[PDB]
Structure 1
Amino acid sequence: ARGNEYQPSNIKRKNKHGWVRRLSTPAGVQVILRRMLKGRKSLSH
């Protein structure tokens, strides 16, 4: 019954975790800054 909580949709993916939304708020900008400091290859989703 459970396990399939991920129902992929690129629109939701980008609107929820994308670069633009991350930069839309100071908290998201700090998310990006933390990923950059850690050296993540993928800063945003």
Structure 2
Amino acid sequence: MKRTFQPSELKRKRVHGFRARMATKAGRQVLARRRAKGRHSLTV
């Protein structure tokens, strides 16, 4: 049966990407939190 995850890299980058996060204040706060926690990879 069809499952929930149907991967598409263009959609992945446009929804969860670095520039998408930079575009809004809440996304910049997300990036700040992840930098403070010390994640090795900030975004997808």
Please give the TM-score of this superposition, normalised by the length of structure 1. Answer: 0.88
Runs of 4+ residues deviating >4 angstroms: none
Which structure 1 segments of 5+ residues have no match?
none
Same amino acid, percent of matched pairs: 48
Which structure 2 segments of 5+ residues have no match?
none
- After superposition, the CA RMSD in angstroms is 1.2
CA distance in 1 between counterparts of 2:4 and 2:32 reads 29
Q: How many residues of Structure 1 are paired with residues of Structure 2 in the alignment? A: 44
Deviations 1:9-44 (A, max 9, x none): 000100000000000000000000000000001111
Please give the TM-score of this superposition, normalised by the length of structure 2. Answer: 0.90
